[PDB]
Amino acid sequence: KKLSTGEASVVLAEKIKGITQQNDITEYGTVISIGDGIARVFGLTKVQAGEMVEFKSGIRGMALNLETDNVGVVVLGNDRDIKEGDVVKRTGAIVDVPIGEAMCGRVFDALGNPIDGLGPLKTTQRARVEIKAPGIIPRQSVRQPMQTGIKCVDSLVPIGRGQRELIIGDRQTGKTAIAIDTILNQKEAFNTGDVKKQLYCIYVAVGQKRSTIANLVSILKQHDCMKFTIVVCATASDAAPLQFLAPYSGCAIGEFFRDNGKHALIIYDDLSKQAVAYRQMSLLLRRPPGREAYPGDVFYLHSRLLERAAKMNDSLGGGSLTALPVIETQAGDVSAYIPTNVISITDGQIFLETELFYKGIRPAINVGLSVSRVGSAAQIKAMKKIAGNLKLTLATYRELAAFSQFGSDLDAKTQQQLNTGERLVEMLKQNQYTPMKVEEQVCIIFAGVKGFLDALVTSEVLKFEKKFLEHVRTNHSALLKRIRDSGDLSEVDTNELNTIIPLFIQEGGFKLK
Template identity: 60%
Template sequence: MTIKDFLFAVINFVILFGALFLITRKMIVRMFKERKEKIAQDLEQSHQADLESQRLSTDVAQARDQARQQEDALLAETRAQVERSSREAEKLRTEEADALRRNAIQTEKQLRSQMHGQVSAQVIRQVASQAGETLKTSTFAPERQALVERYIEQVKEVVAAMPSDILNMNELKKLNISIASPEPLTDEEMKKVTQILCETFLSVRNEVDDGLVGGVRMQVGDTVYDGTLAHQLDRLSQEVEFNSRMDDQEELSVLESIREKLSGTDNSIDVYQTGKVISVSDGICHVSGLADVMAGEMLEFEGSLRGMVMDLDKNNVGVVLLGDFSTIQEGDTVRRTGHIIEVPVGEAMCGRVVDALGRPVDGKGPIQNDGFRAVESPAPSVLHRQGVTVPLQTGIKAIDALVPIGRGQRELIIGDRQTGKTAIALDTIVNQKGKGVHCIYVAIGQKESTVANVVRKLTELGAMDYTTVVCASASEPAPMLYIAPYAGAAIGEYFMYKGKDVLIVYDDLSKQAAAYREISLLLQRPPGREAYPGDVFYLHSRLLERAARLDEASGGGSMTALPIIETQAGDISAYIPTNVISITDGQIFLETGLFHSGTRPAINVGLSVSRVGGAAQVPAMKQVAGRLRTDLAQYRELASFAQFGSDLDASTQATLLRGQHMTELLKQDQFAARAVEDQVIAIFAANEGYADDVDLADMPRFEREAVEYVKQAMPELVDTICAGKKIPADMLDKLRETLKSFKETF
């Protein structure tokens, strides 16, 4: 390579390098500048990261300190909570122990009382038996002779011809008279007795029965004139066994009790009529004799069993047995009591659970009643009644607004099983707390567990203090189910005729009608429609007619009846439902479909009615709920047609929307009663359309908050409603403005 070529190559390289330098200089400068800026930015970020790390370290330290402080505070609070819980648990244990101790003391007293009565009865029976054996000895022969002579002298005053004896004399021209005594009467004694009876009676004979101990017992037809020692000792034993002792005598010894009973025994002649059991089956028996017995009279059987006369035939009477009849046999003696079947009544019945005869079944000891009242009593006269004008608030919006109930009214609750009939009745009872209304709940043919749950719930809510529960459970004989409603009505009438207000619930009368049908068929009465006897209408009419509101001259009391009827598959045209509907002043019909769809109470507005109407509503409720029934009925009708088409005009859509919100507003949980002023405010707000744009799920909150807002803003409105006055027009305008301002904040 020559020098020329070398120089040429060098020159070319220099030229090429210069050209490249000129071309890439700006790019290189920019690249180095960007790199420098990036390095500076990275350095700045690194510095910021260091600062952030320091700040985070500080925050972590602070958080650690705060966590330690919170931990210490939490531990301290936990210790305090544990101490409070321990104190509360100790207090609760102490209260439970005190309650158990009180229950144990009460149970011990009850057991002592029961044992005292049982021991007294046993000792009395043993003493009576020993006394009878002792009095049979020859030592007491003069006393026995004196007893016979005294009987002959006294029988002149008491012997008389009964109507049945006169009938037998007219038909048979003869009447058998037997005179029983432990020893044969002398000729002189028989002559004296015959002289007393010869004017009327024939065929007198003397029967010797050494079991009579002393004295004489004479039977004329069915009537017994008993002056024997054996009878007096037997009645003494029964009195100790069946009569409850007074509270101030509970500490008496058995010996003092016997001495007390013996000192009260008199030697007068006991006059009564007897009969003989000729057949018994399924709680029904037929008794011969007892020709003068009354319909509905209580009879005494051997032991503690009682019966009620239902049928009067020429040769025998039909009796329903009120209790366990397994010990009754053919040939047993039956004794008349002389009075219609009755139950104990009084203030002490409040808070107690009793059976159909008024006997306590709650284990709280005997009831100190104020007297007795016949279960079958006549209804108040038309002249002593007054109209139903005073509302009886149930606390249920759908009822108080649509089918109001007044004091003295008879409002039927009807529907299929498991539709909430009992729930409405219990809600009504609970809502009477503090309102001076005595409540009676008659459970007919229900399970004992169901009745126990009802009593427990009423006790928890404080409603048993003014409530009496009459229980005729499903395990009891049909006669007990039959008379239970009448017994409840008799207990309620005691308060009504004293000028007080009473609410009575019959749950339910369908089972009473079935029990009456069973009794009638066993008594061989001719069956009618659905095998019910012909007087089944009278069965319920004479019961429900006893509910009334008395005028001021008769005390001004009232008894409101809520009978319950169970239907089959919603058939309200069956025999018993139609009968009771025709007797009552309206009905609340509960529908199964509504219940299962979540509408509770499941009241069918179209079939439910109150024949008292607005007379049983407070004026404010009548004012705001006047068109509610019509609107709901129109909504139900449109809702059924709207299912078949989607092209609806604006008016129909507005009606459906209003109906949906109103239906949602009327829903209510059990035992969640609403005061009447709260109901008026809520219904007015929904009627005026303030809830139309509220979500259905928010309706309970809307109701609750709207009522509270209005009550705080307008206390005078609450006073007006509670005073039973209509709401003035200016107050209605103010209420609209108040609801409008509430709606802006909702």
């Protein structure tokens, strides 16, 4: 052989001396080696796997490798503090984080420590970070929508509560933007008081600089959408174990709502980065590396997490936990290791293209690849109908786009389909930090599928959208109220809409052709 890390000269010397003094080996440990944030500890028997331990200085660690002669611990802090020979005492409890309502409106660390400085956190109890996901029985069919506010998503890629939707795309394509837009739309219920619709939002930041997080918090405070959202931060400066725990800490905070019958939405930003942190801990522990140096159970790491987002049945309370994991593809290739895993785990994926972002299509959502398994079951009764026709038209238009540059040369009835598709894509565009209520979405998508937009010039579609909504919001308020309460587009409302839209297009100042 070569050697064993447990055969230290100091430990061996005691055996040779013959003095059987271990200074309470159980529940106490002595550090043998420290490197790259990993400390091997001799002794410390009776320590559970995944338990917190306290070092002489005060920093905590997590016992991840229980070996025969030592314990491989990952230090939750700066590695410079503790040195060889230090004593390690097991805390006696698995890692847990505080939960409750008093947390909404506060920025927390991975372990629940408030870093915003607003004051001491007052909560009732704490929950374990690692637990099993609900079974098959406790669950229930996904029948309730989670309105992101994005026209393209809510129409073509519907997200139902208790669903796992993956926001995947290259760098700087508008992924974090979609997450924040969702949070803003959820604010109307808290302001109004519709408890049935209230959806608490949880934002988990992994491997992100603190500057962008401060900007993110300012935006939420600016739009007032704070006070019902929780931000969990594991920044780039934080040790790797913290970036690995943050998602689980956030998921536990969300399970609180889910168990109690409340609805919560959790967003993991830079989820791929969490895998990188886990890989570091694993490689430093000398565990067998796999493809792209990732450990064998990287997949497992994500599954046990995402599977905790579920729609509990009415017996348990009816709560739900909707997930929105983010993934950054390097060259737009989803054939990589981590993308394939998270795609196989999640229900559907929102695929963002950078080329579309350049072409001015914001959000740069590729509806061709983007798919939702739940599908229509999530949408409200009003959308499902028109959304189906919308999807078909876009599919035909993408097929025909190959001939876009040859417009006049091609015959009629085909160039017309090309023109129609352009109006729709322009309608699907949307500004940043501008979420739309579902009722307004129905009116706009209705105007588009019926074909009224073919009259206008493409450049005027967005002006019509904002201007027409203002008129409908002002005058036809009962129409919107019905769509909001009933949840479906009745025949009478359809006729009312079908008559005023073209009339508005004429009296509107915007040109047409």
